[PDB]
PDB file of all heavy atoms in Angstrom:
ATOM      1  N   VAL S   1      68.102 133.591 147.847  1.00 32.14           N
ATOM      2  CA  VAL S   1      67.655 133.755 149.226  1.00 32.14           C
ATOM      3  C   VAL S   1      67.530 132.401 149.912  1.00 32.14           C
ATOM      4  O   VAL S   1      67.996 132.214 151.036  1.00 32.14           O
ATOM      5  CB  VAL S   1      66.301 134.484 149.289  1.00 32.14           C
ATOM      6  CG1 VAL S   1      65.750 134.467 150.708  1.00 32.14           C
ATOM      7  CG2 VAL S   1      66.441 135.908 148.772  1.00 32.14           C
ATOM      8  N   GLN S   2      66.908 131.453 149.217  1.00 31.50           N
ATOM      9  CA  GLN S   2      66.756 130.096 149.728  1.00 31.50           C
ATOM     10  C   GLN S   2      68.037 129.285 149.526  1.00 31.50           C
ATOM     11  O   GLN S   2      68.092 128.099 149.854  1.00 31.50           O
ATOM     12  CB  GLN S   2      65.561 129.410 149.064  1.00 31.50           C
ATOM     13  CG  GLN S   2      64.220 129.993 149.484  1.00 31.50           C
ATOM     14  CD  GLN S   2      63.123 129.732 148.471  1.00 31.50           C
ATOM     15  OE1 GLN S   2      63.360 129.748 147.263  1.00 31.50           O
ATOM     16  NE2 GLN S   2      61.912 129.489 148.959  1.00 31.50           N
ATOM     17  N   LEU S   3      69.061 129.938 148.985  1.00 31.98           N
ATOM     18  CA  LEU S   3      70.384 129.340 148.861  1.00 31.98           C
ATOM     19  C   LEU S   3      71.286 129.858 149.978  1.00 31.98           C
ATOM     20  O   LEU S   3      72.125 129.127 150.507  1.00 31.98           O
ATOM     21  CB  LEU S   3      70.995 129.677 147.500  1.00 31.98           C
ATOM     22  CG  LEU S   3      72.446 129.257 147.256  1.00 31.98           C
ATOM     23  CD1 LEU S   3      72.563 127.745 147.142  1.00 31.98           C
ATOM     24  CD2 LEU S   3      72.995 129.941 146.016  1.00 31.98           C
ATOM     25  N   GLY S   4      71.101 131.127 150.333  1.00 30.27           N
ATOM     26  CA  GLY S   4      71.898 131.766 151.365  1.00 30.27           C
ATOM     27  C   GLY S   4      71.524 131.331 152.768  1.00 30.27           C
ATOM     28  O   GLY S   4      72.356 131.367 153.679  1.00 30.27           O
ATOM     29  N   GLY S   5      70.268 130.923 152.939  1.00 31.11           N
ATOM     30  CA  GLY S   5      69.769 130.447 154.220  1.00 31.11           C
ATOM     31  C   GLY S   5      69.978 131.431 155.354  1.00 31.11           C
ATOM     32  O   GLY S   5      69.702 132.623 155.217  1.00 31.11           O
ATOM     33  N   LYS S   6      70.473 130.927 156.480  1.00 33.24           N
ATOM     34  CA  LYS S   6      70.814 131.772 157.616  1.00 33.24           C
ATOM     35  C   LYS S   6      72.330 131.939 157.694  1.00 33.24           C
ATOM     36  O   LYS S   6      72.915 131.932 158.779  1.00 33.24           O
ATOM     37  CB  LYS S   6      70.273 131.173 158.916  1.00 33.24           C
ATOM     38  N   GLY S   7      72.956 132.096 156.531  1.00 32.56           N
ATOM     39  CA  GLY S   7      74.403 132.169 156.441  1.00 32.56           C
ATOM     40  C   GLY S   7      75.010 133.540 156.681  1.00 32.56           C
ATOM     41  O   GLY S   7      76.160 133.640 157.112  1.00 32.56           O
ATOM     42  N   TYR S   8      74.250 134.597 156.402  1.00 32.28           N
ATOM     43  CA  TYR S   8      74.756 135.958 156.566  1.00 32.28           C
ATOM     44  C   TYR S   8      75.051 136.249 158.032  1.00 32.28           C
ATOM     45  O   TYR S   8      74.232 135.969 158.907  1.00 32.28           O
ATOM     46  CB  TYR S   8      73.765 136.993 156.015  1.00 32.28           C
ATOM     47  CG  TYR S   8      74.349 138.386 155.853  1.00 32.28           C
ATOM     48  CD1 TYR S   8      74.773 138.842 154.612  1.00 32.28           C
ATOM     49  CD2 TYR S   8      74.472 139.244 156.942  1.00 32.28           C
ATOM     50  CE1 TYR S   8      75.307 140.110 154.459  1.00 32.28           C
ATOM     51  CE2 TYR S   8      75.008 140.513 156.798  1.00 32.28           C
ATOM     52  CZ  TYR S   8      75.423 140.940 155.554  1.00 32.28           C
ATOM     53  OH  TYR S   8      75.955 142.202 155.405  1.00 32.28           O
ATOM     54  N   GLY S   9      76.228 136.807 158.290  1.00 31.88           N
ATOM     55  CA  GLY S   9      76.622 137.179 159.636  1.00 31.88           C
ATOM     56  C   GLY S   9      77.169 136.017 160.442  1.00 31.88           C
ATOM     57  O   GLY S   9      77.485 136.162 161.624  1.00 31.88           O
ATOM     58  N   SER S  10      77.281 134.859 159.799  1.00 30.37           N
ATOM     59  CA  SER S  10      77.807 133.667 160.451  1.00 30.37           C
ATOM     60  C   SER S  10      79.243 133.410 160.016  1.00 30.37           C
ATOM     61  O   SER S  10      79.813 134.169 159.233  1.00 30.37           O
ATOM     62  CB  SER S  10      76.941 132.450 160.122  1.00 30.37           C
ATOM     63  OG  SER S  10      76.973 132.160 158.735  1.00 30.37           O
ATOM     64  N   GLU S  11      79.822 132.331 160.530  1.00 34.94           N
ATOM     65  CA  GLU S  11      81.172 131.936 160.155  1.00 34.94           C
ATOM     66  C   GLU S  11      81.133 131.075 158.899  1.00 34.94           C
ATOM     67  O   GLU S  11      82.171 130.648 158.394  1.00 34.94           O
ATOM     68  CB  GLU S  11      81.840 131.169 161.299  1.00 34.94           C
ATOM     69  N   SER S  12      79.928 130.832 158.393  1.00 37.24           N
ATOM     70  CA  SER S  12      79.733 129.959 157.240  1.00 37.24           C
ATOM     71  C   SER S  12      79.928 130.688 155.914  1.00 37.24           C
ATOM     72  O   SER S  12      79.322 130.325 154.906  1.00 37.24           O
ATOM     73  CB  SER S  12      78.342 129.327 157.284  1.00 37.24           C
ATOM     74  OG  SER S  12      77.332 130.317 157.207  1.00 37.24           O
ATOM     75  N   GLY S  13      80.781 131.707 155.916  1.00 32.58           N
ATOM     76  CA  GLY S  13      81.025 132.508 154.730  1.00 32.58           C
ATOM     77  C   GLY S  13      81.604 131.721 153.571  1.00 32.58           C
ATOM     78  O   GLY S  13      81.193 131.900 152.425  1.00 32.58           O
ATOM     79  N   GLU S  14      82.559 130.846 153.870  1.00 31.31           N
ATOM     80  CA  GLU S  14      83.223 130.052 152.840  1.00 31.31           C
ATOM     81  C   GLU S  14      82.269 129.092 152.135  1.00 31.31           C
ATOM     82  O   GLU S  14      82.262 129.000 150.906  1.00 31.31           O
ATOM     83  CB  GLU S  14      84.401 129.278 153.435  1.00 31.31           C
ATOM     84  CG  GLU S  14      85.631 130.128 153.689  1.00 31.31           C
ATOM     85  CD  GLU S  14      86.259 130.637 152.405  1.00 31.31           C
ATOM     86  OE1 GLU S  14      86.138 129.951 151.368  1.00 31.31           O
ATOM     87  OE2 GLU S  14      86.871 131.725 152.432  1.00 31.31           O
ATOM     88  N   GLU S  15      81.465 128.381 152.918  1.00 33.34           N
ATOM     89  CA  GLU S  15      80.549 127.389 152.372  1.00 33.34           C
ATOM     90  C   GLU S  15      79.380 128.043 151.636  1.00 33.34           C
ATOM     91  O   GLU S  15      78.827 127.466 150.698  1.00 33.34           O
ATOM     92  CB  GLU S  15      80.043 126.467 153.484  1.00 33.34           C
ATOM     93  CG  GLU S  15      79.853 125.025 153.052  1.00 33.34           C
ATOM     94  CD  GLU S  15      80.160 124.040 154.165  1.00 33.34           C
ATOM     95  OE1 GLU S  15      79.631 124.217 155.282  1.00 33.34           O
ATOM     96  OE2 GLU S  15      80.934 123.090 153.917  1.00 33.34           O
ATOM     97  N   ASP S  16      79.014 129.250 152.060  1.00 29.90           N
ATOM     98  CA  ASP S  16      77.947 130.003 151.407  1.00 29.90           C
ATOM     99  C   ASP S  16      78.339 130.412 149.990  1.00 29.90           C
ATOM    100  O   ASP S  16      77.577 130.209 149.044  1.00 29.90           O
ATOM    101  CB  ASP S  16      77.578 131.248 152.219  1.00 29.90           C
ATOM    102  CG  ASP S  16      76.774 130.920 153.463  1.00 29.90           C
ATOM    103  OD1 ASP S  16      76.130 129.850 153.497  1.00 29.90           O
ATOM    104  OD2 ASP S  16      76.785 131.739 154.407  1.00 29.90           O
ATOM    105  N   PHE S  17      79.527 130.989 149.850  1.00 28.13           N
ATOM    106  CA  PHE S  17      79.997 131.461 148.551  1.00 28.13           C
ATOM    107  C   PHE S  17      80.263 130.302 147.598  1.00 28.13           C
ATOM    108  O   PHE S  17      80.194 130.461 146.380  1.00 28.13           O
ATOM    109  CB  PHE S  17      81.249 132.326 148.702  1.00 28.13           C
ATOM    110  CG  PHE S  17      81.764 132.874 147.402  1.00 28.13           C
ATOM    111  CD1 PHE S  17      81.046 133.833 146.706  1.00 28.13           C
ATOM    112  CD2 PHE S  17      82.968 132.434 146.875  1.00 28.13           C
ATOM    113  CE1 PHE S  17      81.517 134.340 145.509  1.00 28.13           C
ATOM    114  CE2 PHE S  17      83.445 132.938 145.679  1.00 28.13           C
ATOM    115  CZ  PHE S  17      82.717 133.892 144.995  1.00 28.13           C
ATOM    116  N   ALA S  18      80.572 129.139 148.159  1.00 24.90           N
ATOM    117  CA  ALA S  18      80.772 127.938 147.360  1.00 24.90           C
ATOM    118  C   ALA S  18      79.454 127.523 146.719  1.00 24.90           C
ATOM    119  O   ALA S  18      79.417 127.099 145.563  1.00 24.90           O
ATOM    120  CB  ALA S  18      81.323 126.817 148.218  1.00 24.90           C
ATOM    121  N   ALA S  19      78.376 127.651 147.483  1.00 21.61           N
ATOM    122  CA  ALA S  19      77.043 127.315 147.004  1.00 21.61           C
ATOM    123  C   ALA S  19      76.554 128.347 145.993  1.00 21.61           C
ATOM    124  O   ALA S  19      75.783 128.026 145.088  1.00 21.61           O
ATOM    125  CB  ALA S  19      76.075 127.214 148.171  1.00 21.61           C
ATOM    126  N   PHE S  20      77.005 129.587 146.151  1.00 22.22           N
ATOM    127  CA  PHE S  20      76.648 130.654 145.226  1.00 22.22           C
ATOM    128  C   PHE S  20      77.353 130.461 143.888  1.00 22.22           C
ATOM    129  O   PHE S  20      76.771 130.696 142.830  1.00 22.22           O
ATOM    130  CB  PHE S  20      77.001 132.020 145.816  1.00 22.22           C
ATOM    131  CG  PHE S  20      76.672 133.176 144.913  1.00 22.22           C
ATOM    132  CD1 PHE S  20      75.383 133.676 144.850  1.00 22.22           C
ATOM    133  CD2 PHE S  20      77.654 133.768 144.135  1.00 22.22           C
ATOM    134  CE1 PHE S  20      75.077 134.740 144.023  1.00 22.22           C
ATOM    135  CE2 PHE S  20      77.354 134.832 143.306  1.00 22.22           C
ATOM    136  CZ  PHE S  20      76.063 135.319 143.250  1.00 22.22           C
ATOM    137  N   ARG S  21      78.609 130.030 143.948  1.00 21.93           N
ATOM    138  CA  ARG S  21      79.399 129.788 142.747  1.00 21.93           C
ATOM    139  C   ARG S  21      78.800 128.652 141.926  1.00 21.93           C
ATOM    140  O   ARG S  21      78.753 128.716 140.698  1.00 21.93           O
ATOM    141  CB  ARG S  21      80.845 129.455 143.115  1.00 21.93           C
ATOM    142  CG  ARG S  21      81.753 129.234 141.913  1.00 21.93           C
ATOM    143  CD  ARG S  21      83.056 128.560 142.311  1.00 21.93           C
ATOM    144  NE  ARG S  21      83.820 129.349 143.272  1.00 21.93           N
ATOM    145  CZ  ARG S  21      84.716 130.272 142.936  1.00 21.93           C
ATOM    146  NH1 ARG S  21      84.958 130.528 141.657  1.00 21.93           N
ATOM    147  NH2 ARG S  21      85.367 130.941 143.878  1.00 21.93           N
ATOM    148  N   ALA S  22      78.345 127.611 142.616  1.00 21.51           N
ATOM    149  CA  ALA S  22      77.758 126.450 141.959  1.00 21.51           C
ATOM    150  C   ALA S  22      76.400 126.790 141.356  1.00 21.51           C
ATOM    151  O   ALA S  22      75.994 126.214 140.348  1.00 21.51           O
ATOM    152  CB  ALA S  22      77.628 125.298 142.942  1.00 21.51           C
ATOM    153  N   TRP S  23      75.705 127.732 141.983  1.00 20.94           N
ATOM    154  CA  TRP S  23      74.383 128.144 141.529  1.00 20.94           C
ATOM    155  C   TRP S  23      74.450 128.922 140.217  1.00 20.94           C
ATOM    156  O   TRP S  23      73.541 128.836 139.392  1.00 20.94           O
ATOM    157  CB  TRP S  23      73.693 128.980 142.609  1.00 20.94           C
ATOM    158  CG  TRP S  23      72.393 129.575 142.175  1.00 20.94           C
ATOM    159  CD1 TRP S  23      71.166 128.977 142.201  1.00 20.94           C
ATOM    160  CD2 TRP S  23      72.186 130.893 141.655  1.00 20.94           C
ATOM    161  NE1 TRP S  23      70.210 129.841 141.727  1.00 20.94           N
ATOM    162  CE2 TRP S  23      70.810 131.024 141.384  1.00 20.94           C
ATOM    163  CE3 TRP S  23      73.031 131.975 141.391  1.00 20.94           C
ATOM    164  CZ2 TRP S  23      70.260 132.192 140.862  1.00 20.94           C
ATOM    165  CZ3 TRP S  23      72.484 133.134 140.872  1.00 20.94           C
ATOM    166  CH2 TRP S  23      71.111 133.233 140.613  1.00 20.94           C
ATOM    167  N   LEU S  24      75.530 129.675 140.030  1.00 23.19           N
ATOM    168  CA  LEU S  24      75.707 130.483 138.826  1.00 23.19           C
ATOM    169  C   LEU S  24      75.782 129.618 137.574  1.00 23.19           C
ATOM    170  O   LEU S  24      76.461 128.592 137.558  1.00 23.19           O
ATOM    171  CB  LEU S  24      76.963 131.349 138.942  1.00 23.19           C
ATOM    172  CG  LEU S  24      76.940 132.450 140.004  1.00 23.19           C
ATOM    173  CD1 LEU S  24      78.305 133.107 140.124  1.00 23.19           C
ATOM    174  CD2 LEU S  24      75.877 133.487 139.679  1.00 23.19           C
ATOM    175  N   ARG S  25      75.083 130.042 136.526  1.00 23.34           N
ATOM    176  CA  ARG S  25      75.049 129.289 135.278  1.00 23.34           C
ATOM    177  C   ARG S  25      75.683 130.058 134.124  1.00 23.34           C
ATOM    178  O   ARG S  25      76.015 129.472 133.094  1.00 23.34           O
ATOM    179  CB  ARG S  25      73.610 128.922 134.911  1.00 23.34           C
ATOM    180  CG  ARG S  25      72.867 128.127 135.969  1.00 23.34           C
ATOM    181  CD  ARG S  25      71.471 127.767 135.485  1.00 23.34           C
ATOM    182  NE  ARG S  25      70.637 127.224 136.552  1.00 23.34           N
ATOM    183  CZ  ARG S  25      69.376 126.836 136.386  1.00 23.34           C
ATOM    184  NH1 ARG S  25      68.804 126.928 135.194  1.00 23.34           N
ATOM    185  NH2 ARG S  25      68.687 126.353 137.412  1.00 23.34           N
ATOM    186  N   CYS S  26      75.851 131.366 134.294  1.00 21.98           N
ATOM    187  CA  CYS S  26      76.316 132.209 133.197  1.00 21.98           C
ATOM    188  C   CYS S  26      77.349 133.258 133.605  1.00 21.98           C
ATOM    189  O   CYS S  26      78.370 133.420 132.936  1.00 21.98           O
ATOM    190  CB  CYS S  26      75.126 132.892 132.521  1.00 21.98           C
ATOM    191  SG  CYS S  26      75.577 134.036 131.196  1.00 21.98           S
ATOM    192  N   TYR S  27      77.079 133.975 134.690  1.00 19.26           N
ATOM    193  CA  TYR S  27      77.924 135.095 135.095  1.00 19.26           C
ATOM    194  C   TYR S  27      79.351 134.672 135.439  1.00 19.26           C
ATOM    195  O   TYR S  27      79.572 133.894 136.368  1.00 19.26           O
ATOM    196  CB  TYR S  27      77.299 135.843 136.274  1.00 19.26           C
ATOM    197  CG  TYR S  27      78.050 137.097 136.662  1.00 19.26           C
ATOM    198  CD1 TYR S  27      77.784 138.308 136.037  1.00 19.26           C
ATOM    199  CD2 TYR S  27      79.023 137.070 137.650  1.00 19.26           C
ATOM    200  CE1 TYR S  27      78.468 139.457 136.386  1.00 19.26           C
ATOM    201  CE2 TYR S  27      79.711 138.211 138.004  1.00 19.26           C
ATOM    202  CZ  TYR S  27      79.430 139.402 137.373  1.00 19.26           C
ATOM    203  OH  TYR S  27      80.116 140.540 137.728  1.00 19.26           O
ATOM    204  N   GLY S  28      80.312 135.196 134.683  1.00 15.63           N
ATOM    205  CA  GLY S  28      81.718 134.912 134.913  1.00 15.63           C
ATOM    206  C   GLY S  28      82.086 133.462 134.666  1.00 15.63           C
ATOM    207  O   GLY S  28      83.136 132.993 135.111  1.00 15.63           O
ATOM    208  N   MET S  29      81.218 132.751 133.951  1.00 15.38           N
ATOM    209  CA  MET S  29      81.417 131.333 133.678  1.00 15.38           C
ATOM    210  C   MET S  29      82.219 131.117 132.399  1.00 15.38           C
ATOM    211  O   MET S  29      82.156 131.932 131.477  1.00 15.38           O
ATOM    212  CB  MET S  29      80.066 130.622 133.576  1.00 15.38           C
ATOM    213  CG  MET S  29      79.286 130.587 134.879  1.00 15.38           C
ATOM    214  SD  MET S  29      80.100 129.582 136.135  1.00 15.38           S
ATOM    215  CE  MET S  29      80.101 127.984 135.327  1.00 15.38           C
ATOM    216  N   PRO S  30      82.987 130.016 132.347  1.00 14.66           N
ATOM    217  CA  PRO S  30      83.756 129.654 131.150  1.00 14.66           C
ATOM    218  C   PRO S  30      82.847 129.344 129.968  1.00 14.66           C
ATOM    219  O   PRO S  30      81.821 128.686 130.139  1.00 14.66           O
ATOM    220  CB  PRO S  30      84.494 128.383 131.582  1.00 14.66           C
ATOM    221  CG  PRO S  30      84.550 128.459 133.071  1.00 14.66           C
ATOM    222  CD  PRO S  30      83.267 129.113 133.476  1.00 14.66           C
ATOM    223  N   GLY S  31      83.223 129.816 128.783  1.00 17.50           N
ATOM    224  CA  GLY S  31      82.442 129.574 127.584  1.00 17.50           C
ATOM    225  C   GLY S  31      81.435 130.672 127.299  1.00 17.50           C
ATOM    226  O   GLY S  31      80.960 130.811 126.172  1.00 17.50           O
ATOM    227  N   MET S  32      81.112 131.456 128.322  1.00 17.19           N
ATOM    228  CA  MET S  32      80.146 132.538 128.176  1.00 17.19           C
ATOM    229  C   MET S  32      80.790 133.779 127.571  1.00 17.19           C
ATOM    230  O   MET S  32      81.967 134.059 127.804  1.00 17.19           O
ATOM    231  CB  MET S  32      79.514 132.880 129.526  1.00 17.19           C
ATOM    232  CG  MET S  32      78.802 131.713 130.182  1.00 17.19           C
ATOM    233  SD  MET S  32      77.478 131.050 129.154  1.00 17.19           S
ATOM    234  CE  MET S  32      77.147 129.507 129.997  1.00 17.19           C
ATOM    235  N   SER S  33      80.010 134.518 126.789  1.00 17.27           N
ATOM    236  CA  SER S  33      80.486 135.746 126.168  1.00 17.27           C
ATOM    237  C   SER S  33      80.322 136.920 127.124  1.00 17.27           C
ATOM    238  O   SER S  33      79.595 136.826 128.114  1.00 17.27           O
ATOM    239  CB  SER S  33      79.717 136.021 124.875  1.00 17.27           C
ATOM    240  OG  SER S  33      79.736 134.890 124.020  1.00 17.27           O
ATOM    241  N   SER S  34      80.994 138.025 126.823  1.00 13.64           N
ATOM    242  CA  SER S  34      80.912 139.215 127.660  1.00 13.64           C
ATOM    243  C   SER S  34      81.098 140.496 126.852  1.00 13.64           C
ATOM    244  O   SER S  34      81.985 140.586 126.002  1.00 13.64           O
ATOM    245  CB  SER S  34      81.941 139.150 128.792  1.00 13.64           C
ATOM    246  OG  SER S  34      83.260 139.081 128.280  1.00 13.64           O
ATOM    247  N   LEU S  35      80.250 141.481 127.125  1.00 13.65           N
ATOM    248  CA  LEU S  35      80.323 142.774 126.461  1.00 13.65           C
ATOM    249  C   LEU S  35      80.219 143.898 127.483  1.00 13.65           C
ATOM    250  O   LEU S  35      80.067 143.649 128.677  1.00 13.65           O
ATOM    251  CB  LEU S  35      79.208 142.912 125.425  1.00 13.65           C
ATOM    252  CG  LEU S  35      79.337 142.084 124.148  1.00 13.65           C
ATOM    253  CD1 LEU S  35      78.085 142.216 123.295  1.00 13.65           C
ATOM    254  CD2 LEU S  35      80.565 142.511 123.362  1.00 13.65           C
ATOM    255  N   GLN S  36      80.299 145.135 127.004  1.00 13.83           N
ATOM    256  CA  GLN S  36      80.189 146.302 127.867  1.00 13.83           C
ATOM    257  C   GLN S  36      78.977 147.136 127.471  1.00 13.83           C
ATOM    258  O   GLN S  36      78.846 147.535 126.312  1.00 13.83           O
ATOM    259  CB  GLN S  36      81.451 147.159 127.755  1.00 13.83           C
ATOM    260  CG  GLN S  36      82.750 146.393 127.945  1.00 13.83           C
ATOM    261  CD  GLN S  36      82.987 145.996 129.387  1.00 13.83           C
ATOM    262  OE1 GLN S  36      82.818 146.805 130.300  1.00 13.83           O
ATOM    263  NE2 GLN S  36      83.378 144.744 129.602  1.00 13.83           N
ATOM    264  N   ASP S  37      78.090 147.404 128.424  1.00 10.88           N
ATOM    265  CA  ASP S  37      76.947 148.270 128.150  1.00 10.88           C
ATOM    266  C   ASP S  37      77.378 149.733 128.082  1.00 10.88           C
ATOM    267  O   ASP S  37      78.572 150.036 128.089  1.00 10.88           O
ATOM    268  CB  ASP S  37      75.826 148.067 129.179  1.00 10.88           C
ATOM    269  CG  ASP S  37      76.299 148.231 130.614  1.00 10.88           C
ATOM    270  OD1 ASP S  37      77.361 148.849 130.840  1.00 10.88           O
ATOM    271  OD2 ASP S  37      75.596 147.743 131.524  1.00 10.88           O
ATOM    272  N   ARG S  38      76.409 150.641 128.029  1.00  9.77           N
ATOM    273  CA  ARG S  38      76.718 152.061 127.916  1.00  9.77           C
ATOM    274  C   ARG S  38      77.263 152.634 129.225  1.00  9.77           C
ATOM    275  O   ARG S  38      77.747 153.765 129.259  1.00  9.77           O
ATOM    276  CB  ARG S  38      75.487 152.853 127.465  1.00  9.77           C
ATOM    277  CG  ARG S  38      74.472 153.115 128.565  1.00  9.77           C
ATOM    278  CD  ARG S  38      73.342 153.998 128.063  1.00  9.77           C
ATOM    279  NE  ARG S  38      72.453 154.422 129.141  1.00  9.77           N
ATOM    280  CZ  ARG S  38      71.390 153.739 129.547  1.00  9.77           C
ATOM    281  NH1 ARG S  38      71.077 152.588 128.969  1.00  9.77           N
ATOM    282  NH2 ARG S  38      70.638 154.203 130.536  1.00  9.77           N
ATOM    283  N   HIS S  39      77.187 151.850 130.295  1.00  8.07           N
ATOM    284  CA  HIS S  39      77.645 152.301 131.606  1.00  8.07           C
ATOM    285  C   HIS S  39      78.998 151.703 131.983  1.00  8.07           C
ATOM    286  O   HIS S  39      79.533 151.988 133.054  1.00  8.07           O
ATOM    287  CB  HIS S  39      76.612 151.961 132.682  1.00  8.07           C
ATOM    288  CG  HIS S  39      75.259 152.546 132.425  1.00  8.07           C
ATOM    289  ND1 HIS S  39      75.014 153.902 132.464  1.00  8.07           N
ATOM    290  CD2 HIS S  39      74.075 151.958 132.130  1.00  8.07           C
ATOM    291  CE1 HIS S  39      73.740 154.124 132.200  1.00  8.07           C
ATOM    292  NE2 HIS S  39      73.148 152.962 131.995  1.00  8.07           N
ATOM    293  N   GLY S  40      79.546 150.872 131.103  1.00  7.63           N
ATOM    294  CA  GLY S  40      80.822 150.234 131.359  1.00  7.63           C
ATOM    295  C   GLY S  40      80.676 148.955 132.161  1.00  7.63           C
ATOM    296  O   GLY S  40      81.657 148.254 132.410  1.00  7.63           O
ATOM    297  N   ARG S  41      79.448 148.655 132.573  1.00  8.56           N
ATOM    298  CA  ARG S  41      79.165 147.422 133.296  1.00  8.56           C
ATOM    299  C   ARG S  41      79.197 146.235 132.338  1.00  8.56           C
ATOM    300  O   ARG S  41      78.658 146.303 131.234  1.00  8.56           O
ATOM    301  CB  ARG S  41      77.807 147.507 133.996  1.00  8.56           C
TER     302      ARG S  41
END
């Protein structure tokens, strides 16, 4: 939330998602493992 700022609904979509990608430490990251739960997620 404090990363997204006032970015929603603005033209700052590209720069927002860049900050979101950098914030991620595990999800979809290289070196990380991945499995499937009972829901296929």
